[PDB]
Amino acid sequence: TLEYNANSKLITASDAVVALSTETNIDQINVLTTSLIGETNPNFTPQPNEALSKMIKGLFESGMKNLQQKKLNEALKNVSLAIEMAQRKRAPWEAFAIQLPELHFMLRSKIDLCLILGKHLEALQDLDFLLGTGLIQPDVFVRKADCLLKLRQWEEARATCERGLALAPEDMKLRALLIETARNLAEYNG
Amino acid sequence: NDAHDLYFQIKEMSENEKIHEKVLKAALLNRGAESVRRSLKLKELAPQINLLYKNGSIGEDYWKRFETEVKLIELEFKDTLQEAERLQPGWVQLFVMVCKEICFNQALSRRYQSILKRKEVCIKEWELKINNDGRLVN
């Protein structure tokens, strides 16, 4: 079953236990309803919003300013909040080819900051997400192998380094990474 | 495992409880996006299914069931578009592209939401000792 709120217009399943796909559909429909409530025009266009983009850009620049002041703690919070707002308060019918590149551009800076700070697992997760979502660049495999070596996973690090060298074998960092990986694995077994 | 029945359930609820009008449009968009996703999935999986069938590793009835699902998906999308036109006049040429975009957008949102649960399974698998601030303490 499912209940329908009156004032908030959110749909919630009043069942004791609910399946996962059904719950995801419920959340998607609730997001769509909340977006249609805010969007006034009946025939909405796939053209993205502008004030939301301005707020996102402002949050991103306020986060990047802390890099010049060299505060890597609040800058991470600011960029994470910006990414959260971009993922939350953005209508799903907005342009995909414009929502994806901004997400990538913010996520790359977040990843760089997260790696510089010392957080490695979140960095690996974001790297894997950005790689699986359709961005393959030699600037990603380097950080991936670096993180996997920082958290002591040599097999996956070697596989990723080999895949990176299989695309841009002219790199000077990937070769050093492969050498370090081979040495660490030889000490790991021998 | 679909949202097609959920739209009908919402319609039956609206026919009795006088719920808002936008929820039906939202469920319509959701079912349309799901149909688009399933159609693209079938279109990209058909060659591999045919290869497995020719290799003789899938059976005989599953191929017919798959070809039947091919046209059932089209019939469902046609019914959804007819219902969309019935719900709002002159809202077909935009509904298609709106669904086409919300499909990819919701797929990306789910893929991104999955990382918070993906982050702990690797912890459990590799026996990391992670303190606060996400650092490693061996």
């Binding site: - | 069938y53 020719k54 003789g56 005989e60 191929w63």
Partner: protein
């Protein structure tokens, strides 16, 4: 060309495994043999695999005749088929059936109107429907086995089955015949062991049951087994010339050139020709008793032709006639060898298997000889294919003559045909790979 909704079995969408194919062949074969053992209701052959007085009186004659006519009209280039389309092929296949059915109609009508069953209507229509259903069943069964559910064609399979059945019956027949001296089995091993058990005179019964001038004996069984093994050994002979591809580099293989190059038809044509000319000589000598030319071309007496061309060309039965007149023996041998050789050459020339056609196929596919040039493929096939075909035909003829003189349980042509049909299945199973 027309639109026809006829019963036809659809080919399997996927490759049928070897075990299921073997089982289907076995069960369809059992059905075909059981269909040939049942007589009709209202009633009151060796070469076309048919028997009189049973539901299989027509047998596979309509199918074989339709196939022969279609092959002939295709060879005369009157259909103008093009392999570029997948519709005219189906049109040819449905023409097969639509001519076979009307031939069955005609043959059943003529046999029921002229046969010795009787002129007197319900019985007549029922006897017609019986043969109609039998013929449609056997045609549908052959179509099923040919669609892919069987190891190969159905006609060749059933011919080989009848050959093997006759061979086994010539040796293990439990039927008895009592003619004055006593009851004696019509089988070889059966009467052999019978005399070995009941006579209680080994030195005499052994030679009595091993010669059997009147009936099949153990010597004929040993002879046919020896010729069977020799033919089996003579089947692996093949010339594999090294070949390579040029369009798609890296495909290395061999093109086998077997010894028995033809499909065993030229000996059949030779036998049919000599039988026809023998019967024609007999008929003409019967019509004209004495004539300056008829007395020279053939004379018949005690039937058997003697002192004539029909006497020269008639086959030898045993070694007595062999040692009797060496001239007739040697001329018969030379004739049966030369005729079979030229028939094999003409068959490879007509059947589109000429070295020119093979060279054209290589040029189309791009295959060339490993250690030779591409402008030498035809010149090399000319030095291989004709000699191989001629020698294979000559060897087939020699085997036939040897079987006919040694007096085996069956004609050598039947033995080689059955072994060919079985060796095709064996080679297909070995190449595809299966249990």
């Amino acid at each position: 060309p027309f639109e026809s909704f006829l019963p036809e079995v659809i080919a399997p969408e996927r490759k049928v495994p070897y075990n299921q194919k073997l089982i289907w062949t076995g069960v369809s074969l059992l059905i075909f043999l059981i269909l040939g053992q049942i007589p009709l209701y209202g009633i009151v052959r060796a070469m076309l695999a048919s028997n009189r007085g049973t539901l299989l009186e027509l047998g596979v004659s309509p199918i074989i005749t339709s196939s022969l006519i279609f092959q002939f009209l295709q060879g005369t280039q009157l259909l103008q088929i093009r392999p570029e389309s997948k519709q005219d092929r189906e049109l040819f296949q449905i023409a097969q059936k639509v001519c076979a059915i009307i031939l069955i109609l005609g043959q059943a009508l003529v046999v029921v109107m002229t046969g010795n069953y009787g002129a007197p209507l319900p019985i007549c229509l029922l006897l017609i429907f019986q043969l109609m259903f039998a013929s449609l069943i056997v045609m549908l069964l052959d179509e099923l086995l040919s669609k892919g559910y069987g190891l190969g064609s159905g006609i060749s399979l059933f011919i080989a089955t009848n050959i093997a059945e006759q061979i086994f019956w010539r040796a293990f027949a439990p039927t008895t015949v009592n003619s004055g001296r006593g009851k004696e089995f019509e089988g070889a091993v059966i009467a052999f062991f019978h005399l070995l058990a009941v006579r209680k005179d080994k030195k005499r019964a052994l030679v009595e049951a091993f010669y059997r001038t009147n009936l099949p004996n153990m010597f004929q069984v040993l002879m046919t087994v020896a010729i069977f093994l020799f033919v089996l050994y003579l089947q692996g002979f093949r010339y594999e010339l090294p070949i390579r591809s040029t369009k798609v580099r890296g495909q290395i293989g061999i093109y086998p050139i077997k010894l028995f190059y033809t499909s065993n038809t030229p000996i059949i044509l030779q036998s049919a020709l000599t039988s026809n000319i023998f019967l024609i000589s007999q008929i003409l000598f019967q019509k004209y008793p004495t004539n300056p030319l008829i007395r020279l071309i053939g004379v018949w007496g005690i039937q058997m032709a003697l002192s004539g061309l029909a006497y020269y060309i008639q086959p030898l039965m045993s070694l007595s006639e062999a040692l009797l007149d060496p001239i007739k023996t040697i001329v018969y041998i030379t004739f049966v060898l030369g005729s079979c050789a030229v028939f094999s050459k003409t068959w490879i020339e007509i059947s589109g298997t000429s070295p020119r056609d093979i060279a054209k196929q290589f040029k189309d596919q791009g295959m060339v000889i490993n250690g030779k040039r591409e402008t030498s493929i035809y010149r090399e096939l000319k030095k291989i294919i004709p000699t191989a075909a001629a020698f294979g035909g000559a060897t087939i003829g020699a085997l036939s003559v040897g079987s006919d003189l040694l007096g085996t349980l069956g004609s050598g042509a039947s033995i080689l045909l059955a072994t060919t049909t079985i060796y095709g299945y064996y080679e297909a199973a070995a190449k595809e790979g299966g249990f």
